[PDB]
Design a protein around this ligand. Structure first.
Ligand code: FGO
Ligand code: SO3
Ligand code: CL
Length: 393
């Protein structure tokens, strides 16, 4: 068990840098621990201790408690909005002040960790949405993988009619809504104001709610989409690439990965970038900061990124990772890794506002759930979301 190995490594160590994370298990937790085990073996008496804090929401709550208690870890995973929050307290070390080189990091990811021109995060486990699909079920009914939103809706209705059940499965949540919202031309910031109830928002939430009414979209209310597989016909989901190993272990059918359907065939749709960056807390000792420096250099190395990305379905964050022989050997055997990289070229972020975590779950996610599960009118549900968000900001 890698967490037992690390516990023993850290027991023999003169300096331990704690890294608080939101991996509850599967391949992401095993890949993070395996990376830490190798880092720790290369050091002389210096270690990283990964500390599971629950999911990402539990992690952000535990960091809030840590600020209140006046005792932060050395490193933590952080979404771009969590970075914005922690910078209000000036709790974060600039990454380049540690002497970590970021050249060769993808500008999609590096730009998202740059605040006021300075980098306060190291992109580590960055995901993109992809189209997961049931190759067997599409083959059975001769339905090509849809390249456009129009094709996707047609494919879902045709397969749902043939199978007697809704085949597009989705979580009624902010992540899923972002795919439809972005690819209907939606934009969350209008002259720097956060807008949740634009016509593209209403259109995105109407399309999902109509999908449920018309019997081609199946809301998943309990667990992850990959935990629900096997109950009723499944053709498609739009989901994080970090879901890849979880789909593979659950799927009784031949799992497919495609680029996202876009407005036209001239370009794939935009996917939502999720997963986290590593931040380094100012409060850490110079000795713990020096361990963070080396760990970050290690996490950005082409081998570390190649192994982590091939073990998980996360997007390798560097140019050098794609040139690493381990990455190349996996990609040559499994086209899904190249599909994830291609889709990572067409990448949108949610707003990096300090309040965004509360807004995306408690306000926006609640409005999506009202409309999908309680048949609330999409505009009325999003107008309420807008009022609650305007009150919070
Ligand atoms: N706190 C906070 N969370 C945020 C923010 N923006 C987006 N997200 C959440 O990031 C999750 C995606 O990040 P990612 O690392 O791509 O995927 C996660 C897991 O989602 C995924 N997983 C785990 C178990 C499983 O059976 N299936 C599976 O796919 O594996 C990875 C590690 O757990 C989304 C999903 C959500 O958690 O419901 C809400 C979303 C934010 O601003 N703050
Ligand atoms: O972001 S570039 O790959 O179009
Ligand atoms: Cl959580």
């Amino acid at each position: 068990k890698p967490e037992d190995v690390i516990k023993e490594q850290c027991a023999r160590a003169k300096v331990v840098a704690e890294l608080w994370h939101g991996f509850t298990g599967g391949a992401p937790k095993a890949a993070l621990e395996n990376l830490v085990v190798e880092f720790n073996k290369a050091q002389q008496g210096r270690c990283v201790r990964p500390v599971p804090q629950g999911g990402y929401r539990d992690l952000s709550t535990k960091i809030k408690a840590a600020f209140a208690a006046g005792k932060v870890p050395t490193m933590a995973q952080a979404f771009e909005n969590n970075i914005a929050l922690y910078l209000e307290a000036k709790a974060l070390l600039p990454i380049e002040s540690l002497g970590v080189k970021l050249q060769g990091v993808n500008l999609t990811f590096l730009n998202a960790v740059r605040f006021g021109g300075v980098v306060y995060g190291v992109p580590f486990n960055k995901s993109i949405q992809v189209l997961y699909y049931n190759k067997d079920l599409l083959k059975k009914h001769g339905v090509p993988v849809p390249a456009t939103l129009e094709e996707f809706v047609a494919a879902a209705k045709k397969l749902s009619r043939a199978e007697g059940g809704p085949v597009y499965w989705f979580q009624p949540d902010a992540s899923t809504f972002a795919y439809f919202f972005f690819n209907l031309g939606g934009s969350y910031l209008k002259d720097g104001k956060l807008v949740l109830n634009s016509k593209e928002a209403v259109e995105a939430l109407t399309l999902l709610q109509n999908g449920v009414k018309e019997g081609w979209a199946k809301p998943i209310t309990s667990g992850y989409i990959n935990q629900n597989l096997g109950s009723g016909p499944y053709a498609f989901s739009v989901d994080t690439s970090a879901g890849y190993t979880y789909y593979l272990r659950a799927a009784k059918f031949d799992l497919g990965v495609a680029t996202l359907p876009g407005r036209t065939k001239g370009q794939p749709g935009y996917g939502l970038v999720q997963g986290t960056n590593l931040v380094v807390f100012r409060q850490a000792s110079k000795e713990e900061q020096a361990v963070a420096k080396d760990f970050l250099e290690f996490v950005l190395s082409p081998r570390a990124q190649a192994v982590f990305a091939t073990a998980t379905g996360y997007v390798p964050v560097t140019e050098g990772a794609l040139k690493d022989p381990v990455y190349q050997a996996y990609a040559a055997e499994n086209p899904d890794y190249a599909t994830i990289v291609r889709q990572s070229r067409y990448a949108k972020f949610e707003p990096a506002l300090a309040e965004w975590e509360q807004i995306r779950f408690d306000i926006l996610g609640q409005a999506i759930k009202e409309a999908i599960l309680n048949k609330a009118d999409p505009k009325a549900a999003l107008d309420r979301a807008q009022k609650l968000a305007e009150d919070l900001l």
